[PDB]
Amino acid sequence: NAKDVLGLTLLEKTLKERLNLKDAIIVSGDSDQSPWVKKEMGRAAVACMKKRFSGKNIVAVTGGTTIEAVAEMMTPDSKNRELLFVPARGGLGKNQANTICAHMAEKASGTYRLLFVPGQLSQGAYSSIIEEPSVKEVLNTIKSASMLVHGIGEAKTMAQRRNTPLEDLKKIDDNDAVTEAFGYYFNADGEVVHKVHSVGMQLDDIDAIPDIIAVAGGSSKAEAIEAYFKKPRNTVLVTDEGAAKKLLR
Amino acid sequence: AKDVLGLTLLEKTLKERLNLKDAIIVSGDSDQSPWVKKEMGRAAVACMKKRFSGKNIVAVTGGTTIEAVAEMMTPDSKNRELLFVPARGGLGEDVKNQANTICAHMAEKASGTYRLLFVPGQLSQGAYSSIIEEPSVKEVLNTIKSASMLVHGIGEAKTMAQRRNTPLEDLKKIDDNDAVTEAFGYYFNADGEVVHKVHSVGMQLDDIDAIPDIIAVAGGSSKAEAIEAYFKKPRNTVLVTDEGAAKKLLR
Numbered sequence: 120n121a122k123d124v125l126g127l128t129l130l131e132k133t134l135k136e137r138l139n140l141k142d143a144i145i146v147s148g149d150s151d152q153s154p155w156v157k158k159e160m161g162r163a164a165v166a167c168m169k170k171r172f173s174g175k176n177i178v179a180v181t182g183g184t185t186i187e188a189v190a191e192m193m194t195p196d197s198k199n200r201e202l203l204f205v206p207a208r209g210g211l212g213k214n215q216a217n218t219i220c221a222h223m224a225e226k227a228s229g230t231y232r233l234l235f236v237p238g239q240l241s242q243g244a245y246s247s248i249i250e251e252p253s254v255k256e257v258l259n260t261i262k263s264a265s266m267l268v269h270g271i272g273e274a275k276t277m278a279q280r281r282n283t284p285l286e287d288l289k290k291i292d293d294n295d296a297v298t299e300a301f302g303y304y305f306n307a308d309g310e311v312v313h314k315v316h317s318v319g320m321q322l323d324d325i326d327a328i329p330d331i332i333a334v335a336g337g338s339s340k341a342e343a344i345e346a347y348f349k350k351p352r353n354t355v356l357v358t359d360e361g362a363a364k365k366l367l368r
Numbered sequence: 369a370k371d372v373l374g375l376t377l378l379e380k381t382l383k384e385r386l387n388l389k390d391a392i393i394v395s396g397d398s399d400q401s402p403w404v405k406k407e408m409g410r411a412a413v414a415c416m417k418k419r420f421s422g423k424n425i426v427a428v429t430g431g432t433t434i435e436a437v438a439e440m441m442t443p444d445s446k447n448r449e450l451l452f453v454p455a456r457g458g459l460g461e462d463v464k465n466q467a468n469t470i471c472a473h474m475a476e477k478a479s480g481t482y483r484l485l486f487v488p489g490q491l492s493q494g495a496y497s498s499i500i501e502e503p504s505v506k507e508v509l510n511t512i513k514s515a516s517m518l519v520h521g522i523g524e525a526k527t528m529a530q531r532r533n534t535p536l537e538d539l540k541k542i543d544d545n546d547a548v549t550e551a552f553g554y555y556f557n558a559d560g561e562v563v564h565k566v567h568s569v570g571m572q573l574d575d576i577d578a579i580p581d582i583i584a585v586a587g588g589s590s591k592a593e594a595i596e597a598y599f600k601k602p603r604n605t606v607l608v609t610d611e612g613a614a615k616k617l618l619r
């Protein structure tokens with residue numbers, strides 16, 4: 120067996136003993152060194168998604184480069200189950216999840232619904248917009264997600280990449296954020312320390328989603344991945360040896 | 369990973385079909401996706417390390433697939449002794465694809481040692497008779513006879529004949545005799561029978577019987593027929609391949 124000779128089976132067993140994980144899927148290599156490893160995580164994640172699909176599916180997705188790799192490897196479902204894709208969230212104050220969710224849907228021969236992309240407005244304007252019947256319909260669809268597919272990032276990297284207010288950068292630093300996922304920053308114990316001003320999915324909502332698949336790897340993410348899974352998330356992690364071996368040794 | 373990708377079942381099907389000691393299959397098709405050759409390299413390396421003894425004499429062939437094995441080689445964590453030797457040579461490859469080049473790269477990457485052997489293919493009878501008696505050549509031939517492992521590729525006959533410097537007379541022979549696969553300078557027909565042997569120093573086909581660990585690394589859809597034909601006879605070999613080849617073979 121390939122997974123036996125590469126040592127992945129024993130490694131996945133141990134990663135699941137260590138982290139709060141429903142299951143672990145580890146591909147060979149370190150994506151920080153070998154770019155194509157992101158594509159193999161993509162392949163593995165798609166295969167995992169397809170094993171979990173029910174007859175009808177609403178799949179919420181995030182917008183980072185590893186989820187893009189999942190979209191690129193997406194293929195139509197052999198079982199022809201019904202597939203609607205949506206972004207898990209949209210920022211307030213470009214939505215990259217929108218791009219990913221459209222690409223993934225086209226690749227799966229599914230359908231999708233995107234979130235509005237507003238200019239800079241007052242809170243009152245945003246509050247009025249989210250109650251608009253057309254917008255509310257997409258938010259309710261996101262609330263009904265049967266699956267979430269998301270990345271995990273280093274906190275400082277994510278906060279700098281965005282256009283994060285100086286007040287919030289200080290909050291993020293001062294509260295020792297180390298990891299980021301779906302618009303939330305968490306500390307080393309996996310506790311929320313800051314949330315991006317967003318619409319769509321909230322951390323409390325993940326509890327009710329039957330299938331959550333986190334796709335994240337590379338040796339530079341070992342600490343972020345460990346922190347995120349310091350609490351139970353009922354999540355299957357698709358990762359690589361880069362991250363898994365650095366975490367476990 | 370292999371579970372969700374269906375690779376675990378594919379490997380069992382392939383191992384049975386070809387009578388292999390083991391089959392290891394990686395995701396995708398190296399004909400569409402170049403990185404897949406790198407993953408075959410990685411899996412081959414793991415395979416080699418699983419089978420290393422305390423002291424090792426590893427015979428290596430050339431070609432771009434074994435070069436990918438070399439590229440993916442890393443030092444042994446158990447720090448076992450590793451000497452790499454080219455299994456033959458004088459096969460008419462450009463230097464970049466010669467066993468003598470690949471063996472040295474693999475040794476470097478493994479932090480092992482290596483022996484050089486360069487004896488080109490089209491020496492006169494007199495020059496060839498004289499060169500094979502030179503101490504450096506005789507010594508390395510003896511080392512090759514002692515190989516504890518062989519790592520080799522498998523090619524399509526036509527593809528190999530074309531890439532190599534193959535004399536007009538021998539192309540006809542390879543074609544007339546319906547060769548469909550090639551390995552370490554032997555061309556075989558669909559039944560795994562030798563139909564043309566390249567004259568060269570070093571390991572001969574009968575010698576592989578005494579090598580206890582043989583790892584064949586070859587993939588891509590274009591190779592399914594060649595892989596099938598090579599394994600028509602018992603080879604006591606582990607095959608490292610990809611979805612591109614295995615799925616087409618079992619089609």
Ligand SMILES: O=C[C@@H](O)COP(=O)(O)O
Pocket residue numbers: 429430431432433434521522523528550551552553
């Ligand atoms: O003898 C078989 C190999 O040289 C095949 O070369 P390749 O790995 O470039 O296909």
Ligand SMILES: [Cl-]
Pocket residue numbers: 147148149150152153156
């Ligand atoms: Cl790697």
Ligand SMILES: [Cl-]
Pocket residue numbers: 182183184185186187269270271
């Ligand atoms: Cl991502």
Ligand SMILES: [Cl-]
Pocket residue numbers: 231232233
């Ligand atoms: Cl839409």
